[PDB]
Amino acid sequence: MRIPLVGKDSIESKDIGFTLIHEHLRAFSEAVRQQWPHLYNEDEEFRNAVNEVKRAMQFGVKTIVDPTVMGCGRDIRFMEKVVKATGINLVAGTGIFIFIDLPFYFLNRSIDEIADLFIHDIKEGIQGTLNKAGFVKIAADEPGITKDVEKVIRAAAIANKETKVPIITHSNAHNNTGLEQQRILTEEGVDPGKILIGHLGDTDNIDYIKKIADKGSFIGLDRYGLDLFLPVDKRNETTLRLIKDGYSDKIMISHDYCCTIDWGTAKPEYKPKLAPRLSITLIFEDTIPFLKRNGVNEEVIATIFKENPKKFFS
């Protein structure tokens, strides 16, 4: 049985079904929450996560992959509770989410030591439980590929080669961080088809997106649930274009919706069209209807949400 699930027995990858590849039940800074618990309400976070997951299931979602890892408040016990309340298939991961430097812990420590943490979570279990990690998550953003960012990428490659689990990335779509992640990983012997380069939906630079897809990795059109770089309308145009041009077998779509997130609220921007309701089901309300009425058939939807995740985890 291929894929470990939180609070359940492992499943064969062929049985993953309709999958959301990048969603967060919760996201927060470990340090802030430890130091100022008065800012947080776990009961509200729990209710929000359960409600969102239930709504996803009502649209036919069978499996959710949650790439919350170190730096963003991964909590396997919170996750297992959401599973108990919903019955969702939930895939947890391991990894480190940094943009610049590692925590002081990692002073004088090797790439192998970092990889050992990942392999621990994959082979032994997460945070003292028998729930195992099913993928590795890594990140890079505006600061680019720093020394420490590269250390983490190389550690992810070691983990993949040992355990065969895939790698999901966070990138900044407006620099070449995604291309660099793919290059470094494949140089270190990672199968390109075992990599999802994240947040490429944040740009409309189609040639850059296709370049990564052509090199054999999945491309993450994965932030439909954030009011980030690109509006939903323009994301949809980019998604449609890539489908028209034959890239369905590389496309992965998700919301990157955080059922709760601890970030401060940004100044709101109002456009001619009423802002879309951001949630874990926006693609069922907006994106998928938009695609269907623009001529893309059911086989495309099945490819993106079923076949592609199956391959990724195979």
- Judged by the rule CB under 8 A, the positions of this chain that interact with a copy of itself are 28-32, 34-38, 69-75, 99-101, 103-109, 113, 117, 120, 127-128, 262-267
Per CB under 5 A, the list member of 26, 151, 170, 250 interacting with Co ion is 170
255 appears as a binding residue in the annotation: no
Q: Which does 105 bind (CB under 5 to 8 A by kind): Co ion, a copy of itself, Fe ion, none?
A: a copy of itself
Q: Give the separation between CA 308 and CA 42, rounded to whole angstroms.
A: 34
Residue whose tokens read 């430097």: 101
Complex with Co ion: residue 22 or 151, whichever CB lies closer: 22
Q: Which stretch binds Fe ion (CB under 5 A): 43-51, 122-130, 250-258, 292-300?
A: 250-258
Minimum Å gap between C-beta 258 and Co ion is 10
Q: Phi/psi at 11 (nearest 5 deg)?
A: -120, 155
Q: Which stretch binds Co ion (CB under 5 A): 111-119, 163-171, 235-243, 261-269?
A: 163-171
Q: Give 307-312's long-range contacts (Cβ < 8 A, gap of 24+).
A: 307/249, 308/218, 308/249, 308/250, 308/251, 308/252, 309/16, 309/19, 309/21, 309/63, 309/65, 309/252, 310/13, 310/14, 310/16, 311/193, 312/21, 312/166, 312/193, 312/194, 312/196, 312/218, 312/252
Q: Is the dihedral of CA 223, 224, 226, 231 positive or negative?
A: positive
Minimum Å gap between C-beta 199 and Co ion is 6
120 appears as a binding residue in the annotation: no
**Of 112, 161, 110, 171, residue with least CA distance to 138:** 171
Complex with Fe ion: residue 182 or 296, whichever CB lies closer: 182
Q: Which stretch binds Fe ion (CB under 5 A): 9-17, 52-60, 256-264, 292-300?
A: 256-264
Beta carbons within 10 angstroms of residue 282's beta carbon: 18
Minimum Å gap between C-beta 161 and Co ion is 24
Beta bridge partners of 195: 167
H or E element at residue 11: strand 8-11
Residue whose tokens read 């009011």: 227
137 appears as a binding residue in the annotation: yes
Complex with Co ion: residue 11 or 156, whichever CB lies closer: 156
Nearest residue to the partner Fe ion, using Cβ: 256
- Does position 74 bind Co ion by CB under 5 A? no
Q: Give the separation between CA 305 and CA 308, rounded to whole angstroms.
A: 6
Complex with Co ion: residue 81 or 170, whichever CB lies closer: 170
- Does position 256 bind Fe ion by CB under 5 A? yes
Minimum Å gap between C-beta 199 and Fe ion is 8
> What is the binding site for Co ion (CB under 5 A)?
170
Cite the annotated binding site by residue number. 22, 24, 137, 170, 199, 256
